């Protein structure tokens, strides 16, 4: 009863397979993966944002110089100007036409928008992948499990336990370095902490948004006030965060392969359909029933009707059941070339009932299986008339 099989990694498609235990009625599983969260390891490097050049009020002495001191402010640029003759408000400020001096101070401070609008660099490791899975097997018709894909750690929800994974492919869409911005993420290579070149990304770097200390390499240069007017003209490179906000590349959120979406909450890729999952489940004995109750279904014949070669359920077929009882009988195809709409079918005493299927080969020679018996439903199919469809449900393309 510990069933083990490999199911291709996709989201919307159920991988109904039949657990055939001898001496008991067969029971059919119905695994479907609602979510496929990759969740890489995360580590915050620093936060970048547009800066703000907070210039304190400049000091002016009428006669004699004024030496500046190196304040501990980030990018504290101080300079002294001589020969200024500042007019202001009521006429001139001083008459020492050569001994007049002005001192200018300027320091870089993270702007108010840094609290809300700000990028976030990250370094990412392999991390651990986890999924939500539905398993509407037997007669239970319920699941809500959220499960690690580490093959070491079974999920233990409901009565049936299961192990899934580990994943066959490690194609995590994230590169070595990731930067997050609002709803979007990017495989940018942020330079480093403390080495940000002016103008480029990372000109303004702080370990966290609330950190008192920061690093500001903005190439700030002070300029002499002209015509004797009281102000602090300064030349500075444009905001580095302003760049790459208009010259950003295509976000990872929209160029990830395999149709993965991205989300910020732990940072993750999700629905990332690649490779295959070894799925193993532990069916509780109480869900099996003695074979002496359910119908045996020998001596049967199979006839398909007008099979289409579409990705919807374009196949319809009829079977001549020769039942030993009346009641239900789980139905399945062990071969992957065919997939069955129906989970189950109800039989009268040697009646006949149809089922719907889908496929991808012109001449599907699939062994249909029914509770403890099998039949070859071989037939012919015809191409689909129409290219208008959104998503598929069978992905079994092979030699044809």
């Amino acid at each position: 009863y510990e069933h083990t099989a490999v199911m291709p990694n996709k989201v919307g498609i159920p991988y109904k397979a039949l657990v055939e235990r001898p001496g008991y009625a067969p029971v059919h599983l119905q695994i479907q993966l609602v979510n496929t969260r990759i969740i890489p390891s995360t580590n915050l490097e620093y936060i970048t944002c547009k800066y703000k050049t907070k210039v304190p009020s400049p000091v002016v002495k009428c006669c004699g110089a004024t030496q500046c001191t190196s304040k501990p402010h980030p990018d504290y640029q101080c300079q002294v100007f001589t020969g200024v003759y500042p007019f202001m408000w009521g006429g001139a400020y001083c008459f020492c036409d050569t001994e007049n001096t002005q001192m200018s101070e300027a320091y870089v401070e993270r702007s108010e928008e840094c609290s809300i609008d700000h990028a976030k660099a990250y370094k990412v490791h392999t991390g651990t992948v986890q999924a939500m899975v539905n398993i509407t097997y037997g007669s239970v018709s319920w699941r809500s499990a959220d499960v690690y894909v580490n093959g070491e750690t079974p999920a233990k929800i409901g009565d049936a336990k299961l192990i899934i994974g580990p994943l066959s492919s490690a194609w995590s869409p994230f590169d070595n370095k990731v930067v997050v911005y609002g709803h979007e993420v990017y495989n940018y290579d942020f330079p480093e902490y403390g080495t940000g070149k002016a103008g480029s990304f990372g000109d303004l770097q702080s370990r966290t948004s609330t950190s008192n200390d920061l690093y500001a390499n903005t190439n700030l240069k002070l300029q002499r006030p002209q015509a004797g007017i009281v102000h602090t003209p300064f030349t500075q490179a444009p905001s580095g965060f302003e760049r790459w906000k208009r010259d950003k590349g295509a976000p990872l959120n929209d160029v990830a392969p395999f149709g993965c979406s991205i989300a910020l909450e732990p940072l993750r890729a999700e629905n990332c359909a690649v490779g295959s999952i070894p799925i193993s489940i532990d069916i509780p004995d109480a869900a099996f029933t003695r074979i002496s109750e359910t119908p045996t279904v020998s001596d049967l014949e199979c006839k398909i009707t007008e099979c289409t070669y579409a990705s919807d359920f374009g196949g319809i077929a009829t079977v001549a059941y020769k039942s030993s009882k009346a009641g239900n009988c789980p139905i399945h195809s062990p071969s992957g070339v065919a997939v069955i709409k129906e989970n189950d079918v109800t039989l009268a005493e040697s009646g006949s009932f149809t089922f719907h299927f889908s496929t991808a080969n012109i001449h599907p020679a699939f062994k249909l299986q029914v509770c403890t018996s099998a039949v070859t439903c071989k037939g012919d199919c015809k191409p689909p008339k129409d290219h208008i469809v959104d998503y598929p449900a069978q992905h079994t393309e092979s030699f044809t």
């Binding site: 009020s57 000091v59 928008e113 609008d117 129409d386």
Partner: protein
């Protein structure tokens, strides 16, 4: 002033916040299917 930096933090009356603005909605494209080819008719109102 030649003296001390007198304190007193004046709160900034209008700080940035994360609100919700109404964004434009481009006209729906006119699809036209073709064999392994998606012909897409587009009639933008503004550069999108």
């Amino acid at each position: 002033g030649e003296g001390d930096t007198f304190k007193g933090k004046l709160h900034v009356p209008f700080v940035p916040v994360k609100a919700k603005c109404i964004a434009t909605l481009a006209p729906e494209p006119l699809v036209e299917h073709k064999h392994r080819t998606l012909i897409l008719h587009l009639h933008p109102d503004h550069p999108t």
